[PDB]
Each structure stands twice: as structure tokens, then as C-alpha cells.
């Protein structure tokens, strides 16, 4: 309910990554990655971020986690939580809270960097008169400039199809 909304969504993003990086059951991992992908889409849309951030949400949370949970469920289940997972989640939460505290009550945080501690509404553009939605025209390339690029991308996709059928018993 304040200005630091990109920071708050980044904090819940790191919350979700820890929440499935503590190695749970893989369907709970898929749930945690769904939460992380939703709030990361929120981050990239708050930088705006109109086209591409919701574009990938159709793929990343529209075409990937379905197959992930699919092959999760039909391969194995192992119906039983464990103390090591809860301990790793507590250590991840403690690392999160310690980084937040040393961003709040200090100036800079060094891993080997100098992060200026304030929610970045700045830097940001000074409202330039587009009238063409810059990133949409960006992705509206690949077709008048992307000669070699879409050729090798579609080529690798065709090879992906033939690789999948060969490994799953070509022909």
C-alpha cells in the first residue's frame, strides 16, 4: 500500500523461489513455481512490460507447468513435513529477512556490488512521447530484420521434435 511495490513483489518472488528450492514434493514445487511466475510477471509488468511479460505467462505458466505436473503425476507419487526441508526453508527466510534489514537500515549492501538501498521508482524514463509501444515494435522485429535468427530457432525446434520421437522410440 505504498511506493515500494516492485520491491515488495521481488520479496514475494524470492519467497516463492525459496519455497520450492527447499526441495519439497515436486507437485508442491510446481505450485511454488506457479506463485513465483505470477509475481515475476507482476514485476515485469510493473516495469511495463505490456507485451512480453504476459506473452511468456502463456508459455511459462501456460505451456510448461502443465507438462511438468503431468509427468510428475503419472511417473511416481510417493505418498508419505520432513525436518530438513523445514530447516532449509527457515534458513532461506532468514537470509531474506537479513538482506531486507540491511537494505532498510543501511546505505549499501555488498556481495561484490554497491546496491543503493531504496525502492527503484528511480531510475525510470521521464515519460517520453512514444505513440508506438516500444517493446511491441521490438518484438515486431524478427521478421524484417531477423533473417538468420528465426531460421536457426525453427531449425532447433524441428530438431527438438525429431529428437523427442527418436528417444521415445523413433519411429
Amino acid at each position: 500500500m505504498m511506493t515500494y511495490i516492485v520491491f515488495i513483489l521481488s520479496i514475494i518472488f524470492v519467497m516463492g523461489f525459496v519455497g520450492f528450492s527447499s526441495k519439497p514434493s515436486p507437485i508442491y514445487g510446481g505450485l511454488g513455481l506457479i506463485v513465483s511466475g505470477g509475481v515475476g510477471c507482476g514485476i515485469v509488468l510493473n516495469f511495463g512490460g505490456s507485451f512480453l511479460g504476459l506473452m511468456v505467462f502463456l508459455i511459462y505458466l501456460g505451456g510448461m507447468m502443465v507438462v511438468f505436473g503431468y509427468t510428475t503425476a503419472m511417473a511416481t507419487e510417493q505418498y508419505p513435513s520432513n525436518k530438513v526441508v523445514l530447516g532449509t526453508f527457515i534458513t532461506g527466510l532468514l537470509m531474506e529477512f537479513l538482506m531486507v534489514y540491511y537494505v532498510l537500515k543501511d546505505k549499501e549492501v555488498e556481495i561484490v556490488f554497491k546496491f543503493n538501498g531504496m525502492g527503484d521508482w528511480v531510475i525510470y524514463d521521464t515519460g517520453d512521447s512514444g505513440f508506438f509501444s516500444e517493446e511491441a515494435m521490438g518484438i515486431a522485429a524478427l521478421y524484417s530484420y531477423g533473417t538468420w535468427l528465426v531460421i536457426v530457432t525453427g531449425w532447433s525446434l524441428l530438431i527438438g521434435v525429431v529428437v523427442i520421437m527418436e528417444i521415445t522410440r523413433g519411429n
Binding site: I59, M64, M137, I139, T147, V161
Partner: protein, 90 residues
């Protein structure tokens, strides 16, 4: 964040509804597997295609015509490949 306001209001409405509904009672097939991966690959090529209508105006329309037809023609090549090589059957 206004759609976040809408989403939060509807999530709270649905959550209060479900909590009232629950706190007031008063093997495997490989043929199943290939459909998901085939979905995955063709949906990735959909993600390549679908920024075409944002692209529909430019200086070089023939290059866009050529590469867009190459994209859909490769999609048809892969589909017809697994069609002829008896993959997606039962």
C-alpha cells in the same frame, strides 16, 4: 494495481465463500506422454508466430512474408513428419 484490486476482492469473496462452505455443514502410457511434449513444442512455435500482427506493418513486407511462411511451413513439416513416421497413434 487496479486489476490487483479486482483480483484481491474476488479472491477474498471466493475464499470467504469456500470457508463458509467447508466450516458450516449445518502405470503409465508413452502414448499419453508424447501429446504433452508435442503440445510444448508447437506452443513454443506459436509463441514465435503470434507477434506477427504487431509486425504486419514495416518497410520490407516481402522479408516478413518469406520468414512467416517459413515458420508455418516448418510447423507443417514437423507435424507431417510425425504423421508419416507413425508416432502419434494408439
Amino acid at each position: 494495481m487496479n486489476l490487483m484490486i479486482t483480483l484481491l476482492t474476488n479472491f477474498t469473496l471466493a475464499t470467504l465463500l469456500v470457508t463458509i462452505a467447508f466450516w458450516l455443514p449445518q502405470p503409465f502410457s508413452m502414448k499419453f506422454f508424447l501429446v504433452a511434449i508435442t503440445f510444448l513444442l508447437f506452443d513454443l512455435e506459436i509463441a514465435l508466430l503470434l507477434p506477427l500482427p504487431w509486425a504486419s506493418q514495416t518497410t520490407n513486407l516481402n522479408t516478413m512474408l518469406t520468414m512467416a511462411l517459413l515458420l508455418i511451413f516448418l510447423l507443417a513439416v514437423s507435424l507431417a513428419y510425425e504423421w508419416t513416421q507413425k508416432g502419434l497413434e494408439w
